[model samples]
Target: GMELDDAYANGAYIEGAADYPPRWAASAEDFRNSLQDRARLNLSYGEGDRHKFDLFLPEGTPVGLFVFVHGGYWMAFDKSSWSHLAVGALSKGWAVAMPSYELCPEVRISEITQQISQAVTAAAKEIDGPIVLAGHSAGGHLVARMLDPEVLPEAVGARIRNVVPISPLSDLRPLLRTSMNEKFKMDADAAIAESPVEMQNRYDAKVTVWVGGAERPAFLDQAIWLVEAWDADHVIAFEKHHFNVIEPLADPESDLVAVITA
Candidate 1:
C-alpha cells in the first residue's frame, strides 16, 4: 500500500513546523501595523467573505504589481499570515497583493482557482504596469492556474511579466490517493482538471518552477512535472527544505525576489 499521506505531510518532517505559523502571523501583523495606511487591508475581490486581499504599497509610486499567494495546501493559512513575505517585492517598489480564498471542503479547488483569478483581476485594476505572480506549495498551484488561458481575463493576462511557483503541486492526481483526499473529495477527473500539469492552453506569462533541494522526493517530482509539462525554467534551491524554501522571499536581495521582480 502506498503511504501518500506521509509523503505529503510537511510539518511532520520540518524541524520547527509548529513555530513557523505563529511567528509568521505575528510578523505579518507587525509588518501591516508598521505600514499603517500603506497597508490596504481586506479589499474585497468578490462577494464571498474570504474573497478579499491585502495590498501593500511601496514608498512613492509602485513600479509594478507583485501578487504572492500563500500555501496551506488550500486548507490552511490566509492572506493575513503572509504580509511580511511581501517585504521583498515592496522594497523593490512593487505593490504586493495577498489574497485569501475560500478553502477546500468548503469550496472545490476549481472554485478556489476561480477566486484567485478574480483576486488577481481585482488587484490589477488598482495598480498599473506589469504583474508578477508567485506562491508557495498550494499557492504555487493557484498561481500556475493563472497561466491557464481561461483562468484570467485577456486584459489582465496581458500584463503578466513573470510567474514563480515555489514547491508547487503542479499535478494533483496523486493527491487522490492521499488520506487528505477525505477533505479534497476529488475524483480522477476532477484531479486532472485542476492540475496545472494538464493545462492545455498556456498564456504568455514567463514561468519559473522552484523547489527546495532538500524537499521530499514527492515535491521534487511535482516540480519536475510542471517544468516538463510547461517547458518552463526550473530552480532547485540548495539545502532548503519545504518549510524554509520560501523564507528567502522575505529577503529583498534574494534571487527568488530577483526572479519574480525581474
Candidate 2:
C-alpha cells in the first residue's frame, strides 16, 4: 500500500540531483557576474520578521518586469537556488526578481501566498512597470495564485500581464494523499481553498501552463486540468524531469522566456 506514496512525493524521486544544484549555483554566479545593474539581494517585503527577494536590473533599459518564484513544494529551495533562472529573461532586456517564502511547518501555504504577494509589491515598486510572473512547481502555483484576484490589492493584480507556470500543482487536494502531507499540515479544506484551480479570477491575463514531457503521469495530468480550466496553453517541455525541468528559463531568448515576455 505504501509502495506508491513516494510517487506523489516527487522531490523524493530526485535522489542523484547533486550535479544539477551545482550547475544552478554556477549559473547564478555567472548571472551576477554579467549583470551591470546593481544586485539587490534579499530585499525584505515586510517589517518585523521579513521575507526577501532579489532583483537584477538590466544593463540597458528594461522592456518588462518579470518575477520568478522557485518551487520546493511549499517546503524547500530559496531565491538563490534558482537565481540563474532569470538570466535568460535578463539577457533579453527584462528586469528579473526572485523571492523566498517562509517554508511549510513554519508557515502554512495560505500565509506564504500573502508573503509572496508582499514580495511582488516590493518588486513592483522597484520595477514600476507591467509584470509577468513565472514559477516552477510549488512556485508555479504561487504565480498562478497571484492572478486569483483575492491574493493581492487591485492595483498590484492589475499590473500582472502574463503568467507562465512551470510544473505547477494547481490543485492541492491531491497532496493530501502523499506522505509529504505530514509536514504540510494542510487538511482537506485548506488544500482546496488555497488551490489555484479552485479559485476564480477577474484578471484575464494570458497563461501558459508548462510541464516536463518526462515528468510523471500525475504531473502531466495535474497540468492538463489547469490548462483546460483556464483555457491556457499547455507546453510540454521535452525530456525534462522534476529537478531539471526549469532549465529552459536560464536562456532569455528561449521560447519559455519569450512566451511570458511576448
Candidate 3:
C-alpha cells in the first residue's frame, strides 16, 4: 500500500475518527450557545458564504490573541466546527478567532492560501493583540504559511507574533502524490510554491512545530523538516494521534496552550 494513503487518511488511522465529527459539531454549538462575554458571529472576511469567522472574547482583559484555523485537508471543516477549541486560550484570558474559508474543488489550494491570509487580516481587525496562529493538519499547513517568506505579504509578519502548527503538512509537494490531489488540484509549481518547507528562510515569530508521536511517519517528517529548514521548536506531544493531537487545545493547562500564550 502507499505511505501517502496513511499519511493523508486521518479518519482511517485514528480510532473513533468517524464519531468525532458529529461530536465536534455538537460541542461547537454548545460552546457558541454558552459564550457569555463578547462574541461576534458570522463576521465576513470575504465575499464567499464560507469566508466568515467567529470571534470569542474573554470577560477579563485579554493578554493576547489566539486564532485557530480548522483542518480538513482544506476540504471538509469550518470555523464553526471548532468554536470549543478556543475555550482553553480564552480561559487564559486571550481572545480567540476562528475563520472558515472557501474549500478546494471550488478554489485551488493556492487560492485557499490567499483566502486564509485575508482571513488573518480580517481577524486582526477584531482583536487588539499579537495574533498567534494555531492549527491542525491542513490548518497547520495554512498557519505555517503565515511565516513563509513569499505566501503572505511582509505586513502579516508584524502582526503575527507566534505560530503553533500542529501536524502541519509543511511540504505540499508530497500531497500532489496522494489521493487528495484531485481535490487539492495542485500542480508541481503550485505545490512547491505553497509549501512552507520548500519556500524556506522565514525565521520570524515564536515558531513551534508540534506533532503527535503516534501520528503517521509522514506527519512526523513534516514537523522535522520544518524544524531543520526553519529552525523552529519541536514537540512530540506524546501519544496523541492526528485527530486528538488537537484535543489539548480545549484544556487550559495543556502544553499546547502554553506554547502560544508563553
Candidate 4:
C-alpha cells in the first residue's frame, strides 16, 4: 500500500513523527549525570578549528566502544542531540564517542568525510576491542563513506567490525531536484562524489540498513538503493512502526540490537 514517492512528499511529517524518543533522552541524561569526567579529543588540524570530537567514557571501567556520527542532511544536526544513543552501548559495557564536524556549505563533502575518519582513528587508540560505527540520516551517508577501503585503509577501517546506518541518504543526485540543495549546495559533481551509491564497491563493511516502514518514499528508496548498490552482504531490516526503527538500539531484544551486540 505504501509507495516511495508518498514517503518523499511527506519528509517533514515523517521525520517529525518520532521526535527523539523519551527513553533515549532519559538514557543519555543518566550517562551524562553519572560520568565522573568528560574528555575532549582534537581530530583536525585546520584554520577554522574545523575538526574535533568529544569522548564520553563511563566511569570506573572500560569495555567495547561505539562511535556515533550525527546527521543533519549533511548540513544540520549535531553530536549533542545524539548523546542518548550512547546509553544502550554503555549499558552493554560499551563506551560511545560522538564527534562534531563542520557542516556542508561551510566545508566540502570530501573534507567532511576526512574529518570523520580522523575522529574515528583518534578515538580507536584510546578504546579497546572492536568499534561499532553507527549514524542516522546524513550521518548514515558518512558511515557508508567510512566503509570504503580506498578511503579508509584496512588497518584503520578494519578496526570497525560493524556499521549501523539508520535512515541513510544513499543517493545524492535526487537532492538536486529537491529544495535540500539550498543548504547542502551539492552540485552534480559534488552529489556524485558524495553519493555512496556512486562511490561504493561490492566490498563493504558489514552494514545493517534500518528505515521506518512508514518513512517517506525517498527514505525507503535510499535504503533499498543502499542495499543494492553495494551488493552489500546485508539485508534491509524493517520496523513496521514508522517512528520506531531506532527503538531497537535501546532494546536488547531487537534484531538490530543483536547485530550490533554480535
**lDDT agreement of model 2 with the native:** 0.82
Q: Candidate 2 deviates by what RMSD?
A: 2.0
Candidate 3 stretches greater than 4 Å from native: 1-3, 153-155, 201-203
Per-model C-alpha lDDT, please?
0.93, 0.82, 0.85, 0.69
Identify the candidate with maximal TM-score. Answer: 1
lDDT at 138, model 3:
86
Off by over 4 Å in 4: 1-11, 15-30, 38-50, 58-61, 200-204, 233-244
The per-prediction CA RMSD against the true structure, in angstroms, equals 1.1, 2.0, 1.7, 4.2
Worst 10 residues of 1 by lDDT: 1-10
* Model 1 ranges off by over 4 Å: none
Model 2 poorest ten-residue lDDT run = 1-10
TM-scores, all models, native as reference: 0.98, 0.93, 0.95, 0.81
| lDDT winner, 2 or 3 | 3
Instruction: Give the local distance difference test score of model 3.
Output: 0.85
lDDT of 2 by residue, 1-262 (tens): 2343766666565667667767777778776766645677878887635388889887877877899988878887778877778778888888899998888878889999998899898888888778999988889899988987778778888888989999998898888877767778888999998888887664768899988888878788879988978889889988888877788787767788888897
Give the Å error, residue 135, model 1.
0.7
- Model 1 clashing residue pairs (backbone): none
